Amino acid sequence: VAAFLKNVWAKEPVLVASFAIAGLAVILPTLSPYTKYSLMINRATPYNYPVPLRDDGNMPDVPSHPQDPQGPSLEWLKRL
Amino acid sequence: IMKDVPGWKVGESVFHTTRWVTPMMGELYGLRTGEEILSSTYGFIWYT
Amino acid sequence: MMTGRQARAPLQFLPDEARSLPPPKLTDPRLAYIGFLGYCSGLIDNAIRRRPVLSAGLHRQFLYITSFVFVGYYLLKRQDYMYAVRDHDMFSYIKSHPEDFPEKDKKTYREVFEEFHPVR
Amino acid sequence: MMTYIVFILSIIFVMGFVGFSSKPSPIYGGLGLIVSGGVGCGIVLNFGGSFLGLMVFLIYLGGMMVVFGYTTAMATEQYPEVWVSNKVVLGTFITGLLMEFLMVYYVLKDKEVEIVFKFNGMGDWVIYDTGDSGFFSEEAMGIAALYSYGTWLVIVTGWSLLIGVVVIMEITRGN
Amino acid sequence: PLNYLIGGCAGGLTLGIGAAACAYMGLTAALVKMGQLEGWKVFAEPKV
Amino acid sequence: PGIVELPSLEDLKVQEVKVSSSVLKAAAHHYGAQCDKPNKEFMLCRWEEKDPRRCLEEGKLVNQCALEFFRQIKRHCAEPFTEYWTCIDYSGLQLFRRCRKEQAQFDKCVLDKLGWVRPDLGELSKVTKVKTDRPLPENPYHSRARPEPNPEVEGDLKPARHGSRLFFWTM
Amino acid sequence: PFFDVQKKLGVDLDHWMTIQSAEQPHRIPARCHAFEKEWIECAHGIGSIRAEKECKIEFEDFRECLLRQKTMKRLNAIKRQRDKLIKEGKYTPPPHHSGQEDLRP
Amino acid sequence: MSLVYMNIMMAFTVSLTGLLMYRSHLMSSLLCLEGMMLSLFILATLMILNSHFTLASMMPIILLVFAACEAALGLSLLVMVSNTYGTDYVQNLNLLQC
Amino acid sequence: MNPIILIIILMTVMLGTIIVMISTHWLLIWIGFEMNMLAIIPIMMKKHNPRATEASTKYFLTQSTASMLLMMAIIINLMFSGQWTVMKLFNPMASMLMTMALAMKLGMAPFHFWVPEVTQGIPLSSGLILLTWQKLAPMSVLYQILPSINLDLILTLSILSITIGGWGGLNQTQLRKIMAYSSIAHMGWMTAVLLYNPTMTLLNLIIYIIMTSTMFTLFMANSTTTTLSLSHTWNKAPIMTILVLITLLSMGGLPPLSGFMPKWMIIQEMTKNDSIILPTLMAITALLNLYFYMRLTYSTALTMFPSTNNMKMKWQFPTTKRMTLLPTMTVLSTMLLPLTPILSILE
Amino acid sequence: MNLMITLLTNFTLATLLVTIAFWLPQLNVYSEKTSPDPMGSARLPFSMKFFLVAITFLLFDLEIALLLPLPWASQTTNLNTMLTMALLLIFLLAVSLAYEWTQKGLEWTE
Amino acid sequence: YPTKETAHWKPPPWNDVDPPSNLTLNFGPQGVLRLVMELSG
Numbered sequence A: 001v002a003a004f005l006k007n008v009w010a011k012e013p014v015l016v017a018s019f020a021i022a023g024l025a026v027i028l029p030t031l032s033p034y035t036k037y038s039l040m041i042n043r044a045t046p047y048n049y050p051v052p053l054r055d056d057g058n059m060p061d062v063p064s065h066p067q068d069p070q071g072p073s074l075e076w077l078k079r080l
Numbered sequence B: 001i002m003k004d005v006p007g008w009k010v011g012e013s014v015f016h017t018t019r020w021v022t023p024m025m026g027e028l029y030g031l032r033t034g035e036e037i038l039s040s041t042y043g044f045i046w047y048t
Numbered sequence C: 001m002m003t004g005r006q007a008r009a010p011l012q013f014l015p016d017e018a019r020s021l022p023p024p025k026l027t028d029p030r031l032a033y034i035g036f037l038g039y040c041s042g043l044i045d046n047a048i049r050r051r052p053v054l055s056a057g058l059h060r061q062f063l064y065i066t067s068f069v070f071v072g073y074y075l076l077k078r079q080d081y082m083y084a085v086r087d088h089d090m091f092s093y094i095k096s097h098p099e100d101f102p103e104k105d106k107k108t109y110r111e112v113f114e115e116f117h118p119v120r
Numbered sequence D: 001m002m003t004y005i006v007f008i009l010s011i012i013f014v015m016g017f018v019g020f021s022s023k024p025s026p027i028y029g030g031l032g033l034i035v036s037g038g039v040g041c042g043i044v045l046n047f048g049g050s051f052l053g054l055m056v057f058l059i060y061l062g063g064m065m066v067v068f069g070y071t072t073a074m075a076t077e078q079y080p081e082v083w084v085s086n087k088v089v090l091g092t093f094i095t096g097l098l099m100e101f102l103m104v105y106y107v108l109k110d111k112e113v114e115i116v117f118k119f120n121g122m123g124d125w126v127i128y129d130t131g132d133s134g135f136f137s138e139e140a141m142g143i144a145a146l147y148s149y150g151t152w153l154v155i156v157t158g159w160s161l162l163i164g165v166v167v168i169m170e171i172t173r174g175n
Numbered sequence E: 001p002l003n004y005l006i007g008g009c010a011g012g013l014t015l016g017i018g019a020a021a022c023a024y025m026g027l028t029a030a031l032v033k034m035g036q037l038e039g040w041k042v043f044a045e046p047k048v
Numbered sequence F: 001p002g003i004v005e006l007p008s009l010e011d012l013k014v015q016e017v018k019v020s021s022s023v024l025k026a027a028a029h030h031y032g033a034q035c036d037k038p039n040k041e042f043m044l045c046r047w048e049e050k051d052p053r054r055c056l057e058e059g060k061l062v063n064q065c066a067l068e069f070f071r072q073i074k075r076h077c078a079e080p081f082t083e084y085w086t087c088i089d090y091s092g093l094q095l096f097r098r099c100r101k102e103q104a105q106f107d108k109c110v111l112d113k114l115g116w117v118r119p120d121l122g123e124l125s126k127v128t129k130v131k132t133d134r135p136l137p138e139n140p141y142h143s144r145a146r147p148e149p150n151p152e153v154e155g156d157l158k159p160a161r162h163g164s165r166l167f168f169w170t171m
Numbered sequence G: 001p002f003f004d005v006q007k008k009l010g011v012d013l014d015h016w017m018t019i020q021s022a023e024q025p026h027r028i029p030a031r032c033h034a035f036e037k038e039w040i041e042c043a044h045g046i047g048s049i050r051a052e053k054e055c056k057i058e059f060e061d062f063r064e065c066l067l068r069q070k071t072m073k074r075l076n077a078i079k080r081q082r083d084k085l086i087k088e089g090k091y092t093p094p095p096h097h098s099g100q101e102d103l104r105p
Numbered sequence H: 001m002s003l004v005y006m007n008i009m010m011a012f013t014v015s016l017t018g019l020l021m022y023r024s025h026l027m028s029s030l031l032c033l034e035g036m037m038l039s040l041f042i043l044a045t046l047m048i049l050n051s052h053f054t055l056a057s058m059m060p061i062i063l064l065v066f067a068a069c070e071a072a073l074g075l076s077l078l079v080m081v082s083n084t085y086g087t088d089y090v091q092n093l094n095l096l097q098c
Numbered sequence I: 001m002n003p004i005i006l007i008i009i010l011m012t013v014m015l016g017t018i019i020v021m022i023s024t025h026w027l028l029i030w031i032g033f034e035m036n037m038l039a040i041i042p043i044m045m046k047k048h049n050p051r052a053t054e055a056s057t058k059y060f061l062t063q064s065t066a067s068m069l070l071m072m073a074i075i076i077n078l079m080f081s082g083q084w085t086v087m088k089l090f091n092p093m094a095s096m097l098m099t100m101a102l103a104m105k106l107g108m109a110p111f112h113f114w115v116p117e118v119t120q121g122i123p124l125s126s127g128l129i130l131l132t133w134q135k136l137a138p139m140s141v142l143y144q145i146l147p148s149i150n151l152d153l154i155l156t157l158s159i160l161s162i163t164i165g166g167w168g169g170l171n172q173t174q175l176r177k178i179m180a181y182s183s184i185a186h187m188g189w190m191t192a193v194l195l196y197n198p199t200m201t202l203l204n205l206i207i208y209i210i211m212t213s214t215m216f217t218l219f220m221a222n223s224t225t226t227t228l229s230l231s232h233t234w235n236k237a238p239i240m241t242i243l244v245l246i247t248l249l250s251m252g253g254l255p256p257l258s259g260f261m262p263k264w265m266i267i268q269e270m271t272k273n274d275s276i277i278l279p280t281l282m283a284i285t286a287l288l289n290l291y292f293y294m295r296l297t298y299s300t301a302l303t304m305f306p307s308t309n310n311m312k313m314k315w316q317f318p319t320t321k322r323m324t325l326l327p328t329m330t331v332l333s334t335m336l337l338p339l340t341p342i343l344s345i346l347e
Numbered sequence J: 001m002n003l004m005i006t007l008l009t010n011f012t013l014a015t016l017l018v019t020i021a022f023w024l025p026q027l028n029v030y031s032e033k034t035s036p037d038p039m040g041s042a043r044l045p046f047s048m049k050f051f052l053v054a055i056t057f058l059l060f061d062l063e064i065a066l067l068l069p070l071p072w073a074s075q076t077t078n079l080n081t082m083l084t085m086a087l088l089l090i091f092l093l094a095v096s097l098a099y100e101w102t103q104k105g106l107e108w109t110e
Numbered sequence K: 001y002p003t004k005e006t007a008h009w010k011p012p013p014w015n016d017v018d019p020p021s022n023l024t025l026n027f028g029p030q031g032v033l034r035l036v037m038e039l040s041g
């Protein structure tokens, strides 16, 4: 499992490089901390119009102006 | 235009509903010149 | 025909409402006939491989009989369920449309006139 | 004249199949199908289907009709044709193709305008630019959704392509 | 029915083999006549 | 069918904002900051009513508040704004990333002479709540009543009377 | 044999591509989103036999939204009458259909 | 119905009539079959782009890929025929009369 | 063939039929038919002889034409309905195209002209698959689109299929072509009762698959491909002699055997719907199938016996062949008629 | 529109250069020459290997046709599913390549 | 039943199989040497 690895690195380095790159491409998106930021950036990219809501009277988490405190903020994206 | 033709309600819809229908390209640019029709319907496609 | 009934609960071999029906007894003539088909399959299986037909493979004939009775018990349960659903839907549609199913006035033969055809 | 261009291409498209459904040869059949693929791709591209037109070129024409011409060229043993000096070897080609465009322009006659003008599409047919879409081709995002929404579709398609490789390698063995 | 039996045998005499085609086309045209009389359906509509 | 009720030409006339798209893109973030309220009341009316014929006057309110956005730039800070939208106007894709010193001059002069804060990255894409006095549409699709569903099955399931009733089978 | 495995197990294998009114990427509407939504909500759960004869108005509105045959018929009628009046010399086109009016926005 | 759809259907039926009257070769049959596939691609694409129905835009590519794989299978069959007789002639494919 | 590759390809055939059976979408119907054809093409070429390549070429041409006609029917449905649900079709042009395409995939007449050829060109197990498993997917689509199927067209195809599958069985000594014309006749029987009661369609399908599988399993157990080669069964394995022929007496449609179970039930659903002439004609043609297949029965259980001397060597060796489910399928193809009201499980 | 004009100008320049390349030396009255290669009268034998590499091109080209919308599919919200299906397609292309390997399909044109 | 069109039809083979070269190039003088090649692909 180690002498076989040295043998296949001696005979066929192309397939060893291919299986190593493919194995890292499989495992490393889960072992990474920055993978969640890909999800967050792709879900915070505004392709549509943010259709507003009628104010029924009791919605504390929804702002009234873009320059309000509450609302989803992208301080993490500006700073990183 | 439609004076001589009998049985013609002007502005008669073809939909039985009264909901607003998004107008087709010919409902807007039908009675106009050909260059405006070309710039309306192939302008974005033919643009370089 | 009844595929709209098995469309809100698909791929149920026996629904829960089928449990409101009596199961077939283990002395059902249909189930004993399916066991006879198992015994026939055992005899044909010992015949086509040139075995002594009654003697050889008594475990094999016992599994033929048991497997046919086992599948046939559930097939008889599903048969009873489907004819019960057929009669239940029939009776509900008769009860829900009386105007399409009027009660015919039964006339006795003292009012009913039949043309007599002499045989000679 | 310029307005009816998709319709014009469609007419040429129909005529293109008459190039090879009459079947003069499998090689000229492939040539007519390549020309028909190009003009049907022009029909696709003139509704804003840019990616689908480039799939016509890249996968249908440059991917598959290359293989059809390749397999045809490994069959149907060839023979020479007329090879006199330039009054035959290119002059007859130019007169024949000028007669082909004469046939293309020749069908737009009084039997055509009774269908064209009574059922005028250009003016109200090509409606792909009806309002705004945004910062994205809707057709591009619909093809992009093959990976998020089309999980079962990609599974059965990749399984069919793997089985296609296996099936070709099993039937082309002879043993 | 009898007239189309005569017509079927007339079509059978111009068919040939003779008497068999006479009887076959006569019985077939008889069934056509009886289907026109009693309303017999060959491609019957699904009703139940 | 019924005659579609299109409003008159006099009911459509308004004072247009006759500026080009680079003028609008250079003045986009401050417009989203300062012209928030009639814009969101209009687009709430536009997605609730699903009909522009009932969204006319609110739309004119947009076209009443956009011009007063630009006049307040034209009285105070027309020259940094002109220098900014000219550099926006040069580019083919109209990049914000090519015009940062003119952006800083326009934001500085606007924050001084008017006091407008350019919004942060992430804020103009927010879903906001909108207080209106107009009613909620009870049927924006103008749909008629649905047909009534079939009566469902109920009751205890009885066995089949005398089996299958198939010619001679008693079970 | 319609073995509805997708309703038994609770998987969505191909329901998403089926109708236009389903969840589209980036909330893109179809051209006939309202008409197909009304035909589906009308004809839901009542079966095909009742759905043919009891939702024909919504279905014809949706078919006419798809094909636009009545709208193309109406535009061909109006354009034919306009061409005949321009040919007779009894009508003149307006400036806002000839291209001399400096369009709205 | 519509006009350009009628043209693409006309091409489909013309390549069908070419696919239903064989002259000499099996490659002519495969070419008429793939002209049919091409017309199906064109007509599906114009419908899907016309209605702005977004998720079906992956459908013609699917309609391409499978069917192109199908054509590959047909080509391989032709090759095995041309490895037995030397030609791809359909009149060499008549041993199954008995 | 590599047995792992054989298992993968057979599971791909089953997967294509299952994708046609379970899908609510037309593209997946088409994908399942494409997968089914693509995977079944090496099953025909298991032996690598020119008759299998000819059979696979004819099968590819017919099934590919049917697949393209199916996709044209789907496309015309998307025109006139804008949707993709596998339900009734919203144009009778698309209905006619899908009915013609499914008749081509089943090999119903007048698109029957590939069925006795291809079944002749391929081995017995691949012919078994072609005549049992490949019916399941187009009959499933016909089950799901029957509110749009034209009555006159499906009855025309049904009676034409029964007549041509009847008169195909005269001139044949090949067992595989006789099974192919029996296939054509039984598909006419199945599609006769489709617009009246599709439960009887599924009953006819299951009884047909059981009888066809019994017959092909007997043909594989005896390795006989012709009538004249079948005629030596009495001297080699005498228990094999009658089981073929009581199964074929079932396949004709003959009481008290269970092959009388479909046709009678089909007549039992067509005299309800006031069609008396049409089941009468179809079952007279089934008696014509009895005529030719009873002549084959006379050929094997009686007159044309005589053996050759090398058969004496076969007496010293039993069948080591897998006769898989052959006693079970032989019991289920004859003695099932007293359990005829089991058909309610197919609703 | 500009694209069609550009294609038409490229096609016109191509046909013009071909027409000049054929008609300009046919001004010459040089010689009518007679008496018409590694084969003289041999037929073409078919080669199975060239057809195998053509069909291998076509099947991997279909797999590439599936792989083409990946720069657009990277922008989606369901990145776990998108990554799984992207890796699954490239893995099935690799499995098709390994099956082409081990069954001696890539031999004598490896 | 052997009719007129069916009399010449012989029966198929029993095991269902039917009874079914390589390239030769001349690399001529086009030092100098001629090469006759029996090639096999």
Ligand SMILES: CCCCCCCCCCCCCCCCCC(=O)OC[C@H](COP(=O)([O-])OC[C@H](O)COP(=O)([O-])OC[C@H](COC(=O)CCCCCCCCCCCCCCCCC)OC(=O)CCCCCCCCCCCCCCCCC)OC(=O)CCCCCCCCCCCCCCCCC
Binding pocket: C027, C028, C029, C030, C032, C033, C036, F168, F169, F170, F171, I256, I337, I338, I339
């Ligand atoms: C405290 C806890 C414990 C309590 C214990 C209580 C129980 C103790 C006893 C346990 C054992 C019970 C056995 C079953 C009960 C009696 C069933 C019965 O006789 O039904 C009368 C049944 C109708 O008569 P019934 O007067 O209306 O009913 C009297 C009872 O109330 C019948 O009542 P039902 O209203 O329930 O009747 C049900 C229904 C009544 O039937 C109907 O509604 C009409 C459908 C009948 C079948 C018609 C099919 C016609 C076309 C196909 C013909 C094929 C060929 C015929 C056979 C050829 C040879 C294979 O049956 C069916 O639908 C199933 C089909 C018939 C199967 C009968 C049971 C057979 C089991 C053993 C099979 C052995 C092979 C026999 C021959 C195979 C064919 C049967 O008779 C017939 O249909 C005649 C056929 C022969 C009947 C089988 C006799 C059973 C015993 C046979 C032993 C000897 C076997 C010899 C070797 C093999 C043959 C060569």
Ligand SMILES: CCCCCCCCCCCCCCCCCC(=O)OC[C@H](COP(=O)(O)OCCN)OC(=O)CCCCCCCCCCCCCCCCC
Binding pocket: A008, A012, A015, A016, A017, A018, A019, A020, A022, A023, A026, J091, J094, J095, J097, J098, J101
């Ligand atoms: C799980 C991650 C994703 C994996 C899938 C994606 C991979 C991307 C690359 C695809 C490659 C496709 C083709 C692979 C074929 C493998 C079999 C093979 O080539 O066997 C033959 C070869 C011996 O060489 P030979 O036959 O002589 O070659 C002819 C020329 N001389 O035999 C060899 O050379 C041995 C080759 C196999 C063993 C290689 C081991 C590499 C290990 C690298 C480190 C660990 C990586 C982690 C994953 C494990 C991978 C095994």
Ligand SMILES: CCCCCCCCCCCCCCCCCC(=O)OC[C@H](COP(=O)(O)OCCN)OC(=O)CCCCCCCCCCCCCCCCC
Binding pocket: G001, I010, I123, I125, I126, I128, I129, I132, I133, I136, I202, I206, I209, I210, I213, I217, I220, I322, I323, I324, I325, I329
């Ligand atoms: C509502 C109902 C829904 C549907 C219900 C279920 C329908 C089932 C349809 C079954 C169709 C099966 C077709 C045949 C099996 C497929 C794979 C196959 O062919 O296996 C046979 C196998 C091949 O071995 P091989 O080595 O190739 O033999 C040739 C000589 N060398 O081995 C052999 O050749 C050995 C010989 C015996 C093979 C017997 C196979 C019988 C399989 C069918 C059983 C009956 C049908 C299922 C039960 C009833 C349900 C209809």
